[PDB]
């Protein structure tokens, strides 16, 4: 009936907050794995979709030194957009 955005398993940092719903079940688990928050993961991810679409071809390494701070973090977010039909890894 109405759109629902909740589960039963033990979440991490995307439970009881805003944005977690805007994330699809794919992005939802994406954050529940890489302990992050919606508005932030949406911010970092927003910087990728905008820097990847601006030029067109983007690399996964360039993202590691671009957003977040280390790499395992950008690796998970970018790995989604990359392998997905969103940004690029060239």
Boundaries of every domain in the chain:
1-90
Give the angle subtended at the CA of 28 by the CAs of 79 and 70, to the nearest 5°: 40
CA–CA separation, 83 vs 29, rounded Å? 16
Cβ(35)–Cβ(59) under 8 Å?
Answer: no
Q: Classify burial at 76, counting beta carbons within 10 Å of its beta carbon; exposed 0-12, middle 13-18, buried 19 or more.
A: middle
Distances (CA, A) of 60 to 2, 40, 48, 89: 37, 19, 10, 5
Fold of the domain spanning 1-90: Arc Repressor Mutant, subunit A (1.10.10)
């Amino acid at each position: 009936g109405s759109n629902s955005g909740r589960r039963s398993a033990p979440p991490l940092n995307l439970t009881g907050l805003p944005g977690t719903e805007k994330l699809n079940e794919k992005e939802k688990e994406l954050c529940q794995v890489v302990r992050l928050v919606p508005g932030a993961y949406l911010e970092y991810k927003s910087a990728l979709l905008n820097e990847c679409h601006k030029q067109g071809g983007l690399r996964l390494a360039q993202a590691r030194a671009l957003i977040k701070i280390d790499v395992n973090k950008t690796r998970k977010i970018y790995d989604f957009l990359i392998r997905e039909g969103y940004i690029t890894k060239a």
